[PDB]
Design a protein around this ligand. Sequence first.
Ligand SMILES: [Cl-]
Ligand SMILES: [Cl-]
Ligand SMILES: [Cl-]
Ligand SMILES: [Cl-]
Ligand SMILES: [Mn+2]
Ligand SMILES: [Mn+2]
Ligand SMILES: [Mn+2]
Lengths: 78, 83, 91, 94, 96, 98, 104, 108
Amino acid sequence: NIQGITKPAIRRLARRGGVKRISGLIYEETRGVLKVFLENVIRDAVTYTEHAKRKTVTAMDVVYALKRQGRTLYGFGG
Amino acid sequence: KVLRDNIQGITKPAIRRLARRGGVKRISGLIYEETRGVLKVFLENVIRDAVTYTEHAKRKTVTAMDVVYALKRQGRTLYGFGG
Amino acid sequence: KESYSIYVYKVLKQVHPDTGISSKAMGIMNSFVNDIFERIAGEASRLAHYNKRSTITSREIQTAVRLLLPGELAKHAVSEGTKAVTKYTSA
Amino acid sequence: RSRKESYSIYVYKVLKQVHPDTGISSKAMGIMNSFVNDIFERIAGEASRLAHYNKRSTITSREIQTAVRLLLPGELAKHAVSEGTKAVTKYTSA
Amino acid sequence: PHRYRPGTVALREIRRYQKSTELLIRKLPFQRLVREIAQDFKTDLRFQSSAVMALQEASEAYLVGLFEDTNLCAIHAKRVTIMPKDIQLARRIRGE
Amino acid sequence: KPHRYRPGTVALREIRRYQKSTELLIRKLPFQRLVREIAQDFKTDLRFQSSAVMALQEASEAYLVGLFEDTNLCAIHAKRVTIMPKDIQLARRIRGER
Amino acid sequence: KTRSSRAGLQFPVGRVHRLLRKGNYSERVGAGAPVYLAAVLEYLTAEILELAGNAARDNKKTRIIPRHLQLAIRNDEELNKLLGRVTIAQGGVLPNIQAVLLPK
Amino acid sequence: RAKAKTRSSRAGLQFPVGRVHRLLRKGNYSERVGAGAPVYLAAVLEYLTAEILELAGNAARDNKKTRIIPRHLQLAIRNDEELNKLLGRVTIAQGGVLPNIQAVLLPK
DNA sequence: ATCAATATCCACCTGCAGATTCTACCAAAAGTGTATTTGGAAACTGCTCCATCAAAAGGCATGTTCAGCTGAATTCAGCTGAACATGCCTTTTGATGGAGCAGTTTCCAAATACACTTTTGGTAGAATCTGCAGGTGGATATTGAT
DNA sequence: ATCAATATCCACCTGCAGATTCTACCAAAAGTGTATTTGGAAACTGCTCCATCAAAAGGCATGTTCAGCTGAATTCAGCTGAACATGCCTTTTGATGGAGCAGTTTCCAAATACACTTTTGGTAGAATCTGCAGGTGGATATTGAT
Ligand SMILES: [Cl-]
Ligand SMILES: [Cl-]
Ligand SMILES: [Cl-]
Ligand SMILES: [Cl-]
Ligand SMILES: [Mn+2]
Ligand SMILES: [Mn+2]
Ligand SMILES: [Mn+2]
């Protein structure tokens, strides 16, 4: 399902990041990097969900998870 | 006596030793001044906060714990100086 | 529960009487205000503790502002804070 | 003149358990004291937020456990959760 | 038949996407990806829509930021093409 | 006839030697003057616990050594073996220091 | 007759005080602490809204949206530093193309 | 009138449950602390301390010393993938670094 | 595949500075009793999300062509490493005077507590207002040919 | 560096969808007034350590010379990645049904708070114990060769 993150979408992200030319190996590399990122964040968000004895991941769970990891997200509070 | 220009006392050989610990084999001649400016910015930032803690405590003596807290604040936890 | 929207809105009308703000943007300002509140209160909490004090006073808030805010933001902040405390105390 | 408390005698007891004939230098003991204080604050700080998020006024062993799971990597968390659970069940039987 | 030179469309695209703010990854494939990863942690999870959206905002900003650093690494090596080795240097220096 | 090691040989021995040891690599008294000069510029008549200077020295050197490691990676990435200011600068930029 | 009105502030002093008492920060809170804090918060808010308002009028819009907050923060050296680890949703990035990538 | 037994001995721990409790209460972490909280916490601090001393003790025996010094602590942590992660932003005073030379720098 | 020259490895030895063990005072856990809080089993209710389905609308996958970027090869000037002598200034260690930590006491300004009263921010429909989803034509950039 | 032919961008425009404002009610915050307590600022003062000084030994910084080999520049080919055309399909978006969560309230048993009294584990120095810092010399490895 990582494959559902398409080469065109990855190209667009690099374009916003200012990138002009892109090696063919970048697309798989990027998929693994995103995967690691999402594993880490979702692992913690779910941990907050469970601690609260909820079965639904809330936006605030994700915000706490991102905070724990030195990333602060504005706009989803709270 | 007036303290002046003490960054220049961080010598080229000491800078070479640090780079050696860092695994560096060859060093441009411009690296020494660049390193001196980077160290100065670092120490300015840490000492500024440590003194702020010193002042808040109303002391005239900077303690190791003032430095530990300053470093902690800045995401650089130092072990071995608490007591 | 609560948010800072009406206060953010009042301050918007002060600096830009004719400018509005979207709902998503108001949400970003709310996170901003909450984030900074927490950073300062936490630093002020740590300051009182290090010094074995049980009270957070305006002096802890000030020092926390000096530790957290850069340069010129710190200077104006400390000014705004002292100004408000002085106006409050006489009133 | 004043009493200075620290974790040294406890680090030393655990040292003798794992390496009975091994000693430790004072600098190395200062590093272990810093380590114990640092992890104490990390767990306790996370447990505090967990309670605050969940509108609870109390930090229980459950907050401690979740904090450990949030803070420790992988197998360290597992073994920590095991030791902590064992100590609590044992204590309660006492 | 008319043809832009290599790099001209790419620069046109940088300008377009640095101007804009919309999410760049398709929402459903991303929602599907987030659900899959989560199931390996606990299988009966539900998601608020705003929670999937926080993950997407957070993920895209992370990857865009990483591409900026990656691009600097490529340029440093006097290249104009990003390669996996640039991604790796960037993440290594970041402490990832 | 007089013996001469080739450029790079002695540097490698230094790498092995200092990566083996843990001693501070900056002379202590000049570092202390530096710390005093900078602190004095924030507030006059400050004193320092001796261990506060040593904490500053441990932290500083650890910082610089860690940065040279990253700098060395940026130089190798550009297929050089020599570190230059642009490498330090790339490292600090990606670190978020600059 | 609000503490906010006595202090000459728009931000809610009584609320900031409640939040300080309830957030487990210390056993006691001084009377001046929430006034000083509310005034810092108000001041930082005004700074960003001033800059985001300017940023909005420059691209000819009358209403601030997240893009304008991001332009405001990222183009300001002290705010950028303060908020260096913060992600603004729907903020995008500063237009910026490395010189070496441009033609001719 | 009962004869005192410490909470640590009840918990089967070496680390001080009583002290950890006091430190939880004095630290502004919450209004109340459950009885099991300081026990679980003490047990976790004790476990981590054990892990590190185990590996550092091994590092001391390898360079022929009977006494652990900061170097052995640093070798212990950085050669362990989970300790290294946990202490990723931590500086060990007098720790030095792991020996490590990039391959491209070695002679041909 | 040797040789000379160097540096590094790596035990040995032993007094002493640093670590460990012991001792006694006492601060703080522990035991007890009792006052408060609290988290939870129950019993509700209305949002939410999940599952499913379908019509189109864009958007992606694919193959081909070729511009031009990457990497290899090659060349050369000059910078940086290695090796020396010289002598400056750091390091040691030792002594001294005294600033200013900390430890103690006393006692108010400033905090908490609590009862009671007003004010207001959150909330939700209804009523109005006005930015923008789209839809252009003209403006602007780009390209191959000279 | 011009010109014409192309392809895309981007001001401009404007109705109306849906954001914003108006209309209005109301718990729950926030304020007030009064009564009590109390953390911590002041004012000491003893006793650590900090600043400073100095000599002397010699470690190490500094300066110089010189050539190895590195970075920088240039040239060139192959082969990868960008730009398209083409057409098939995944995603959007717009609804629906309904269950299965959360979020509230009440209400007592179970849990935690906290003052006082006993008891003892933890600390500070004192008294011992003893790894290993340094200071050797020799064995062994590595280097760069004429
Ligand atoms: Cl508990
Ligand atoms: Cl690669
Ligand atoms: Cl450079
Ligand atoms: Cl105050
Ligand atoms: Mn000065
Ligand atoms: Mn109102
Ligand atoms: Mn008192």
